[PDB]
């Protein structure tokens, strides 16, 4: 037998953050956001305690998709009815709803799980620079 | 746009004769002067609308939070408050009558809570057809057809969301558009609308400026009698 591995439990302390998503791309931003939310980079990562930090993403509509994807790759959403496919294009997503784009691109990178739906709510994606979350005193770091 | 609106109580239905040699059915709507109870501006509240209070009641027959709201806002107490989107050209604390909103013969639309028709079956509800009665067609012959979508795991194996089966019908809001206004009566605070208005005799009836034909008016006169003896 052996010494039991150490595992923090309800010993969580989470600090907010700010990243200005000015000219980043979608997916490269999304993996960094997903890891920051899960606390995958924490030195003491307990796989079942939501040991990860909060996150606020600013200037969502300025994010960019490489290549001609803006006219060729579609995002779908289906109601449970028939003929309910709503099919929108990257150019239309970067204009009509941009925060929903980053939100969905982040959520899919989390595991099918019971904290995933509780992790994803720690991502606040404002479309423009201004916000009402200055009260929480976030730090600020570039490209994460 | 510059949507205009007013409320009343539908009092019944009759007919009146016009020039152009035509008989015109009519609904009669009792419209007590209303009272703007709040105005929402675009910048302040992210949209625009006007909140109207009506069906004045005694202060006793009124809940305390509402009567407090009325006393603080300097109004007459009213049983009902509801609001109209995109009504702009009005201020606070003002009485509004239908004469001040609609031309003599122009186009309005009417919303009203329809007539509650009970738990009704599919064939009256969705205008379905009735299975034949001759040749002995078996006792379930008043049904919604076959609800089938696919037999066997490959095809569909369920009933489709938003099917058409029996249920509750009536007592739901509906609206008839492009119904012209015939005339008014300032003595009784009463208005005349063409056509047939949804809702039972005595319900609450909202009139708005028709979206299909916003400003369109075509005048229609009456048919004063000239036969006496
Ligand atoms: Mg038999």
From Swiss-Prot, chain A:
<dbReference type="Pfam" id="PF00572">
    <property type="entry name" value="Ribosomal_L13"/>
</dbReference>
<dbReference type="GO" id="GO:0022625">
    <property type="term" value="C:cytosolic large ribosomal subunit"/>
</dbReference>
<protein>
    <recommendedName>
        <fullName>Large ribosomal subunit protein uL13</fullName>
    </recommendedName>
</protein>
<comment type="subunit">
    <text>Part of the 50S ribosomal subunit.</text>
</comment>
<comment type="similarity">
    <text>Belongs to the universal ribosomal protein uL13 family.</text>
</comment>
<dbReference type="GO" id="GO:0003729">
    <property type="term" value="F:mRNA binding"/>
</dbReference>
<dbReference type="GO" id="GO:0003735">
    <property type="term" value="F:structural constituent of ribosome"/>
</dbReference>
<dbReference type="GO" id="GO:0017148">
    <property type="term" value="P:negative regulation of translation"/>
</dbReference>
<keyword id="KW-0689">Ribosomal protein</keyword>
<keyword id="KW-0687">Ribonucleoprotein</keyword>
<comment type="function">
    <text>This protein is one of the early assembly proteins of the 50S ribosomal subunit, although it is not seen to bind rRNA by itself. It is important during the early stages of 50S assembly.</text>
</comment>
<dbReference type="InterPro" id="IPR005822">
    <property type="entry name" value="Ribosomal_uL13"/>
</dbReference>
<dbReference type="InterPro" id="IPR005823">
    <property type="entry name" value="Ribosomal_uL13_bac-type"/>
</dbReference>
<dbReference type="InterPro" id="IPR036899">
    <property type="entry name" value="Ribosomal_uL13_sf"/>
</dbReference>
<dbReference type="InterPro" id="IPR023563">
    <property type="entry name" value="Ribosomal_uL13_CS"/>
</dbReference>
<dbReference type="GO" id="GO:0006412">
    <property type="term" value="P:translation"/>
</dbReference>
Swiss-Prot record, chain B:
<keyword id="KW-0694">RNA-binding</keyword>
<comment type="subunit">
    <text>Part of the 50S ribosomal subunit. Forms a cluster with proteins L14 and L19.</text>
</comment>
<dbReference type="GO" id="GO:0006412">
    <property type="term" value="P:translation"/>
</dbReference>
<comment type="similarity">
    <text>Belongs to the universal ribosomal protein uL3 family.</text>
</comment>
<comment type="function">
    <text>One of the primary rRNA binding proteins, it binds directly near the 3'-end of the 23S rRNA, where it nucleates assembly of the 50S subunit.</text>
</comment>
<dbReference type="GO" id="GO:0003735">
    <property type="term" value="F:structural constituent of ribosome"/>
</dbReference>
<keyword id="KW-0699">rRNA-binding</keyword>
<dbReference type="GO" id="GO:0019843">
    <property type="term" value="F:rRNA binding"/>
</dbReference>
<keyword id="KW-0687">Ribonucleoprotein</keyword>
<keyword id="KW-0689">Ribosomal protein</keyword>
<dbReference type="GO" id="GO:0022625">
    <property type="term" value="C:cytosolic large ribosomal subunit"/>
</dbReference>
<protein>
    <recommendedName>
        <fullName>Large ribosomal subunit protein uL3</fullName>
    </recommendedName>
</protein>
